[PDB]
């Protein structure tokens, strides 16, 4: 009933209703993200689910309908918010202390002395509780949650773009594949996949030990358009030889997207 | 032993249960079980792995001037 | 007293702390009064829609809680002897959340006033207003994010 | 071999009906008890009054008007309305049942027209008395004052 | 009625949250007493919070009988 | 009137003051060069970041009630449009996102500088740039937001008339959106060579 508001689907195409059973409440819980506030939603809906026989017979208002019509939407927005809150490690603004920490303080210090922690290991599940109460805590989390958001929308978008293909292969529209699908794929994957592969690669390099300097990714993405062949800090070998190719490939896909299908119409 | 291989070793275990569940999903409402579970496990993995990789080789370490000397 | 710690430096924090609740209060008043007059016009003939049409009056009250959250965080970064780096941070934070919430607030009033009048005549038109009205309440938020990024850099490596 | 229609929409078929005029009225009840069929409009160019069953529909349109008049007088008073079995016809599961007669429907006409003639008079014989009343109370209240 | 359900569910979890809190002050958990601005004496604060939870427990059992009848 | 009288009574004091100093041999006393040098480059840099995300939110919030107040009126008779005409509320919100991407980029350039090297060639350069780049992105997205609201209030009224006409007016609504994307580019080019405060 959510997708049908936006539009009724064409005959025998992919329904937007199956992915929406999971992707609608999981995006909610990235934002909402707390074990306390989520445990409350879970109860508020779990009262509507168990008493549904009693509630359905009795008469209802206009607000109390939608809370009842979506009593299973709210159940999954609560369960997933207890998973995401556990990873963020936030329960009513406070933290849990389940596992050993990958950070270690000095053996000795004094009052008022700014102290820094030293690394030991990696924390298995979630954000380490050493960040809680810390002075520089947002600098870490803001960088973390941005890169989460960019990666989780690229996957949400590409997966929904492979539903175009699944339709064209069911209605036997071959030209639209070569016309629309294959050029548009290369356009964004070559630009916004290259960004997402570089975020995962930078996280997987010990920059300090190796001695090389970590590069900024906002500038790396800008200069490849404005000034190709140029680099200030290198991320991997042959970086410039690959960037200019990806720029070449995107610019080819523009007119190929523009011209290929009308010409087939004229030639019939 | 905590490394980028640790993320792959989970992806093998998770990219196999999706396969076994595809086979074993019941016939009644087969598409809802089959899509919902496979698509749930994946977004549970991607959000673990992102949260793990941001901690292997961090570039800034936590710093404070507020603790008690006793700790 | 010093080239890096003048005596007029707290002026930009105190004026920034004040201007965050001043500009967000004004917005939430334009959007409460304006909205509030449609509710007092439709519910003379349709009193059954009263509790459902207070939703614009809620959205503007949240605009004011944002400006209170920024006044509370910049206040505890103040001091007689603080740098001039710190003062202009405290300024831009208040000027961001304030100017952003003032604008969001006025839109909540104009759109919320029209929705309550229309939905009385077309009950399918309530959800259409609830959509349009979230894109205004989120602009007060985008100003709050800027204020928080800046406050982090306030007393970092200062001397 | 029933299909599931969640990943893609269900497959459909277009059917034709050769109904005799005798049993047209009876067949339409059964098709409505199912709740499976969506009819096209073949007579899409014909004007609304040139259609053929228009005369049968006014007899029934007039009756609904006469019933709206009744529900108004009720609500004008404090009477509550009886609520019968909403399931005696069906349970929504596509079950069969036999429809009314053509004579029963012709009785609703004369009855409903016969009731409108009485109530419309009984209300005006009531209101005119209340006008005489209100006039005298005002004539009475004024005299009470000194 | 709703005048009684409110303080029943409210005071339900006041018994739970305040007791979990008091347990932690008593055991001197780092997050609750670690910073200097936090209170100095752990168990003293727990003694004050064990009692506060009992006050909610009375409202819970009372309103339980009120709605139960 | 009164408000316009003051605009003409300011112009008359700036002139009588300029000629007092000039005829007396003191025209050098009105020196804009020192003001630009002696004022702190943190002032200019923290105005620009505020006037970018602030003036961008003014524009977005503006177009949302031109497009929003007409849809709701048009939606009384044609309630089917409020989800089809929703795309106009989306191009008006997005100019605010552009003003928030800048402030992410520019906030990185806010660093503490030594007292001896505060009024240097590079740190003055960096305050002047983040000021005019913020003005640029903010004042330009203010204009793209008001414009797209006007365009999208018509497309609501046309769609209620006839469903076909909605598509034809979107083309006008796309070209308007280009204005905000060009402003973002120009700002990044300004602050490309600017370096963090030393
Ligand atoms: C006629 C009086 C009655 C009317 C009163 C109404 C307000 C009038 C305006 C008041 C402000 C202007 C007069 C005060 C300026 C002089 C203060 C002073 O000496 O400060 C000096 C000192 C610098 O000293 P040195 O660098 O060592 O140099 C030697 C000194 N020359 O600088 C300062 O302290 C500057 C402070 C100026 C503040 C002026 C503004 C005050 C706030 C007014 C806000 C009005 C707008 C509303 C804001 C709304 C949003 C919150
Ligand atoms: C702002 C602060 C206050 C917030 C108060 C929130 C109170 C809780 C409200 C309920 C939230 C959970 C339910 C929402 C998800 C389910 C919605 C759903 O299924 O909608 C279906 C419905 C279509 O069918 P119906 O029109 O219901 O008719 C046929 C029904 N068989 O879907 C649509 O209309 C499409 C749009 C869906 C999303 C709409 C969400 C709107 C939420 C509005 C909240 C209003 C709160 C009012 C508070 C007043 C308190 C006195
Ligand atoms: C990085 C991004 C990672 C996520 C990408 C995931 C893409 C998955 C797409 C799956 C789409 C799907 O379900 O297709 C079903 C559809 C079947 O349709 P029906 O009409 O049921 O067939 C009738 C006859 N039996 O399958 C197809 O025909 C298409 C199959 C596509 C397989 C794609 C494999 C994965 C490709 C990854 C590429 C990644 C980027 C490079
Ligand atoms: C799943 C889909 C993955 C698609 C991207 C493939 C990237 C391959 C990365 C890789 O293997 O590089 C390793 C290797 C380094 O290995 P060592 O640390 O020396 O250790 C080797 C012995 N253990 O990498 C390098 O040498 C440098 C980094 C290379 C990055 C290349 C980036 C290519 C960009 C392509 C653009 C298109 C992206 C499409 C994404 C699709 C996602 C499904
Ligand atoms: C969103 C989650 C993304 C990450 C998880 C993806 C799972 C699927 C992985 C398939 C990747 C295939 C190509 C790369 C194979 C790499 C093989 C490998 O093990 O390389 C290890 C080696 C590191 O070794 P050490 O430095 O010794 O480890 C730490 C020591 N303390 O890896 C590297 O150097 C770089 C690896 C780059 C991985 C790139 C993966 C690209 C994924 C793109 C996803 C985009 C959307 C999100
Ligand atoms: C030294 C500093 C002096 C600052 C003076 C500020 C003057 C403000 C002028 C102004 O905007 O006037 C209000 C303006 C005048 O409009 P007109 O139609 O031209 O009115 C005359 C009609 N016959 O009207 C409005 O803006 C709307 C009404 C509310 C105005 C509120 C003004 C408050 C001014 C506070 C100044 C405090 C200074 C310290
Ligand atoms: C760095 C800061 C720079 C500040 C610059 C301020 C510029 C203000 C421009 C005002 C323009 C304006 O409104 O002009 C009004 C008026 C024209 O009025 P009409 O339309 O002819 O009236 C009859 C209509 N029926 O023109 C003028 O005021 C011209 C003189 C303007 C001088 C500047 C005024 C400065 C005011 C104080 C700023 C602080
Ligand atoms: C208020 C003053 C308005 C402008 C007139 C100035 C008259 C004046 O002072 O003339 C002498 C003054 C010299 O003064 P000092 O001894 O150097 O310093 C003391 C200054 N009081 O002369 C000058 O400096 C020349 C200034 C010329 C500016 C233009 C004056 C135009 C006046 C028109 C007025 C018309 C009536 C209203
Ligand atoms: C406008 C506000 C700023 C005006 C600044 C005027 C003073 C100034 O900066 O002068 C700089 C400089 C002189 O330098 P000094 O060292 O003083 O003399 C030369 C020594 N070898 O000025 C010039 O070169 C000439 C500039 C003249 C600008 C005009 C005067 C400013 C006011 C506007 C006047 C407009 C015409 C008025 C006509 C009135 C008729 C009723
Ligand atoms: C309560 C609220 C109060 C609000 C107050 C409002 C005030 C508005 C601004 C007023 C600024 C006035 C500045 C000029 C004052 C003045 O006369 O200065 C003269 C003074 C000379 O003094 P002496 O004692 O003669 O020096 C002797 C040296 N041996 O001049 C100087 O020294 C130079 C000063 C130059 C200042 C120029 C400032 C201009 C600023 C404009 C804004 C910046 C540009 C913005 C561009 C925006 C584009 C959209
Ligand atoms: C109609 C009539 C028009 C009349 C216009 C008259 C303009 C008068 C301008 C006067 C300028 C005088 C400049 C001057 O002399 O200032 C001093 C000083 C030089 O001092 P020195 O000689 O080195 O000192 C030696 C000390 N021993 O001047 C300079 O360095 C700066 C010169 C340029 C002045 C600039 C004035 C302000 C301009 C602001 C522009 C803002 C642009 C806004 C764009 C907005 C886009 C949206
Ligand atoms: C969605 C709403 C968004 C705007 C909310 C208000 C925010 C205001 C500040 C935003 C930053 C500046 C951007 C430009 C805003 C311009 C607004 C504007 O046009 O103001 C108009 C408005 C007049 O409106 P009316 O024509 O009377 O009423 C409407 C008739 N149909 O303008 C004014 O009131 C001008 C006031 C000028 C005062 C100048 C005094 C300056 C004093 C300085 C010290 C000396």
UniProtKB/Swiss-Prot annotation, chain B:
The keyword Transmembrane applies. Residues 25-35 are cytoplasmic. GO terms for biological process: cell wall mannoprotein biosynthetic process; endosomal lumen acidification; Golgi lumen acidification; protein-containing complex assembly; proton transmembrane transport; transmembrane transport; vacuolar acidification. Residues 1-3, 57-71 are lumenal. GO terms for molecular function: ATPase-coupled ion transmembrane transporter activity; proton-transporting ATPase activity, rotational mechanism. Coiled coil: none annotated. Keywords: Hydrogen ion transport, Ion transport, Membrane, Transmembrane, Transmembrane helix, Transport, Vacuole. The chain crosses the membrane at residues 4-24, 36-56. It is a multi-pass membrane protein. It is found in: Vacuole membrane. GO terms for cellular component: fungal-type vacuole membrane; Golgi membrane; proton-transporting V-type ATPase complex; vacuolar proton-transporting V-type ATPase complex; vacuolar proton-transporting V-type ATPase, V0 domain. Belongs to the V-ATPase e1/e2 subunit family. V-ATPase is a heteromultimeric enzyme composed of a peripheral catalytic V1 complex (components A to H) attached to an integral membrane V0 proton pore complex (components: a, c, c', c'', d, e, f and VOA1). This is V-type proton ATPase subunit e. The lineage of its organism: Eukaryota, Fungi, Dikarya, Ascomycota, Saccharomycotina.
From Swiss-Prot, chain D:
It is found in: Vacuole membrane. It comes from the Eukaryota. Glycosylated. Residues 115-143 form a coiled coil. Belongs to the V-ATPase 116 kDa subunit family. Present with 55714 molecules/cell in log phase SD medium. V-ATPase is a heteromultimeric enzyme composed of a peripheral catalytic V1 complex (components A to H) attached to an integral membrane V0 proton pore complex (components: a, c, c', c'', d, e, f and VOA1). Subunit of the V0 complex of vacuolar(H+)-ATPase (V-ATPase), a multisubunit enzyme composed of a peripheral complex (V1) that hydrolyzes ATP and a membrane integral complex (V0) that translocates protons. V-ATPase is responsible for acidifying and maintaining the pH of intracellular compartments. Is present only in vacuolar V-ATPase complexes; enzymes containing this subunit have a 4-fold higher ratio of proton transport to ATP hydrolysis than complexes containing the Golgi/endosomal isoform and undergo reversible dissociation of V1 and V0 in response to glucose depletion. This is V-type proton ATPase subunit a, vacuolar isoform. The chain holds residues 3 to 148 of 840 of the full protein.
UniProtKB/Swiss-Prot annotation, chain E:
One of its GO terms (molecular function) is proton-transporting ATPase activity, rotational mechanism. One of its GO terms (biological process) is endosomal lumen acidification. One of its GO terms (cellular component) is Golgi membrane. Coiled coil: none annotated. It is a multi-pass membrane protein. It is found in: Endoplasmic reticulum membrane; Vacuole membrane. The chain crosses the membrane at residues 5-25, 49-69. Accessory component of the V0 complex of vacuolar(H+)-ATPase (V-ATPase), a multisubunit enzyme composed of a peripheral complex (V1) that hydrolyzes ATP and a membrane integral complex (V0) that translocates protons. V-ATPase is responsible for acidifying and maintaining the pH of intracellular compartments. V-ATPase is a heteromultimeric enzyme composed of a peripheral catalytic V1 complex (components A to H) attached to an integral membrane V0 proton pore complex (components: a, c, c', c'', d, e, f and VOA1). This is V-type proton ATPase subunit f. It comes from Saccharomyces cerevisiae (strain ATCC 204508 / S288c) (Baker's yeast). The chain holds residues 7 to 75 of 85 of the full protein.
Swiss-Prot record, chain F:
It is a multi-pass membrane protein. Gene3D superfamilies: lithium bound rotor ring of v- atpase (1.20.120.610). The keyword Protein biosynthesis does not apply. Signal peptide: none annotated. GO terms for molecular function: P-type proton-exporting transporter activity; proton-transporting ATPase activity, rotational mechanism. The keyword Ion transport applies. Residues 21-46, 107-129, 190-198 are cytoplasmic. It is found in: Vacuole membrane. Residues 68-85, 151-168 are vacuolar. It holds the Pfam family ATP-synt_C. GO terms for cellular component: fungal-type vacuole membrane; Golgi membrane; membrane; proton-transporting V-type ATPase complex; vacuolar proton-transporting V-type ATPase complex; vacuolar proton-transporting V-type ATPase, V0 domain. The record marks 93 as: Essential for proton translocation. Keywords: Hydrogen ion transport, Ion transport, Membrane, Transmembrane, Transmembrane helix, Transport, Vacuole. The chain crosses the membrane at residues 1-20, 47-67, 86-106, 130-150, 169-189. GO terms for biological process: endosomal lumen acidification; Golgi lumen acidification; proton transmembrane transport; vacuolar acidification. PANTHER family: V-TYPE PROTON ATPASE PROTEOLIPID SUBUNIT. Belongs to the V-ATPase proteolipid subunit family. V-ATPase is a heteromultimeric enzyme composed of a peripheral catalytic V1 complex (components A to H) attached to an integral membrane V0 proton pore complex (components: a, c, c', c'', d, e, f and VOA1). The decameric c-ring forms the proton-conducting pore, and is composed of eight proteolipid subunits c, one subunit c' and one subunit c''. This is V-type proton ATPase subunit c''. It comes from Saccharomyces cerevisiae (strain ATCC 204508 / S288c) (Baker's yeast).
């Amino acid at each position: 009933s959510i997708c049908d508001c936006y539009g009724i689907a064409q005959y025998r195409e992919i329904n937007a209703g199956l992915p929406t059973i999971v992707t609608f409440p999981f995006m909610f819980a990235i934002m909402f993200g707390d074990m306390g506030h989520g445990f409350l939603m879970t109860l508020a809906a779990l009262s509507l689910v168990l008493n549904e026989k009693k509630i359905n017979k009795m008469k209802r208002g206009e607000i109390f309908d939608m809370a009842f019509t979506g009593r299973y939407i709210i159940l999954l927005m609560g369960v997933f918010s207890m998973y995401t809150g556990f990873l963020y490690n936030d329960i009513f603004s406070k933290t849990m202390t389940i596992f050993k920490s990958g950070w270690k303080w000095p053996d000795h210090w004094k009052k008022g002395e700014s102290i820094t922690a030293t690394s030991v290991g990696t924390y298995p599940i979630g954000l380490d509780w050493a960040w809680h109460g810390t002075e520089n805590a947002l600098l870490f989390s803001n960088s973390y949650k941005m890169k989460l958001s960019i990666l989780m929308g690229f996957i949400h978008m590409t997966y929904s773009y492979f539903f175009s293909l699944a339709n064209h292969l069911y209605f036997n529209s071959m030209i639209d594949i070569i016309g629309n699908f294959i050029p548009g794929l290369l356009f964004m994957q070559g630009i916004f996949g290259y960004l997402s592969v570089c975020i995962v690669y930078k996280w997987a390099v010990d920059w300090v030990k190796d001695g090389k300097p970590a590069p900024g990714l906002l500038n790396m993405l800008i200069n490849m358009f404005l000034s190709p062949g140029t680099i200030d800090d290198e991320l991997y070998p042959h970086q410039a030889k690959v960037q200019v190719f990806l720029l070449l490939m995107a610019l080819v896909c523009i007119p190929w997207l523009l011209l290929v299908k009308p010409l087939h119409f004229k030639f019939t | 032993m905590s490394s980028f291989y640790t993320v792959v070793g989970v992806f093998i275990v998770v990219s196999a249960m999706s396969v076994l569940f595809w086979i074993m999903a019941p016939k009644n409402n087969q598409a809802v079980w089959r899509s919902t579970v496979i698509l749930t496990l994946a977004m549970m993995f991607l959000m673990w792995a992102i949260t793990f990789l941001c901690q292997l080789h961090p570039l800034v370490a936590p710093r404070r001037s507020d603790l008690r000397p006793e700790f | 007293m010093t080239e890096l710690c003048p005596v007029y430096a707290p002026f930009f924090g105190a004026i920034g702390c004040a201007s965050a609740i001043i500009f967000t209060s004004l917005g939430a008043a334009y959007g409460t009064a304006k909205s509030g007059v449609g509710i007092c016009a439709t519910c003379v003939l349709r009193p059954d829609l009263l509790f459902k049409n207070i939703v614009p009056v809620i959205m503007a009250g949240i605009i004011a809680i944002y400006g209170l959250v920024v006044s509370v965080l910049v206040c505890y970064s103040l001091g007689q002897k603080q740098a001039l780096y710190t003062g202009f941070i405290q300024l831009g934070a208040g000027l961001s959340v304030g100017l952003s919430g003032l604008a969001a607030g006025f839109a909540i009033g104009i759109v919320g006033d029209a929705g309550v009048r229309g939905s009385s005549q077309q009950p399918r038109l309530f959800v259409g207003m609830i959509l349009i009205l979230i894109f205004a309440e989120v602009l007060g938020l985008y100003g709050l994010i800027v204020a928080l990024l800046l406050n982090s850099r306030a007393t970092q490596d200062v001397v | 071999e029933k299909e599931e229609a969640i990943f893609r929409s269900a497959e459909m078929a277009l059917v034709q009906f050769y109904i005799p005029q005798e049993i047209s009225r009876d067949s339409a009840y059964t098709l409505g008890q199912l709740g499976l069929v969506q009819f096209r409009d073949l007579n899409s160019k014909v004007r609304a009054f040139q259609r053929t069953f228009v005369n049968e529909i006014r007899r029934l349109d007039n009756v609904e008007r006469q019933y709206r008049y009744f529900y108004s007088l009720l609500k004008k008073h404090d009477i509550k309305l009886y609520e019968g079995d909403t399931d005696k016809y069906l349970d929504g599961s596509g079950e069969l049942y036999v429809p009314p007669s053509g004579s029963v429907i012709d009785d609703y006409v004369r009855n409903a027209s016969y009731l409108e003639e009485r109530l419309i008079q009984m209300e005006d014989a009531t209101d005119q008395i209340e006008v005489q009343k209100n006039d005298l109370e005002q004539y009475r209240f004024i005299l009470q004052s000194g | 009625t709703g005048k009684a359900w409110c303080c029943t569910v409210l005071s339900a979890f006041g018994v739970v949250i305040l007791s979990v809190i008091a347990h932690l002050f008593n055991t001197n958990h780092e997050s609750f007493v670690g910073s200097i601005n936090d209170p100095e004496d752990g168990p003293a604060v727990a003694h004050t919070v064990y009692l506060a939870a009992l006050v909610y427990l009375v409202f819970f059992v009372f309103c339980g009988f009120q709605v139960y009848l | 009137s009164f408000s316009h009288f003051l605009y003409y009574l300011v112009l008359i004091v700036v002139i009588v003051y300029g000629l007092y100093k000039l005829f007396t041999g003191h025209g050098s006393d009105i020196n804009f060069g020192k003001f630009l040098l002696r004022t702190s480059p943190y002032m200019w840099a923290n105005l620009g970041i505020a006037l970018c995300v602030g003036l961008s939110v003014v524009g977005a919030a503006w177009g949302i009630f031109i497009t929003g107040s007409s849809m709701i009126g048009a939606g009384v008779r044609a309630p089917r449009i409020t989800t089809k005409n929703l795309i106009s509320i989306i191009f008006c919100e997005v100019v605010a996102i552009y003003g928030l991407i800048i402030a992410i980029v520019f906030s990185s350039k806010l660093t503490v500088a030594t007292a001896e090297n505060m009024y240097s060639k590079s740190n003055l350069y960096t305050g002047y740039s983040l000021f005019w780049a913020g003005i640029t992105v903010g004042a330009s997205n203010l204009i793209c937001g008001i414009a797209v609201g006007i365009t999208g209030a018509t497309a609501a009224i046309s769609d209620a008339a006839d469903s076909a006409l909605f598509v034809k007016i979107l083309v006008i609504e796309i070209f308007g959106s280009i204005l905000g994307l060009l402003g973002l580019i120009v700002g990044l080019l300004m602050a490309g060579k600017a370096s963090e405060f030393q």
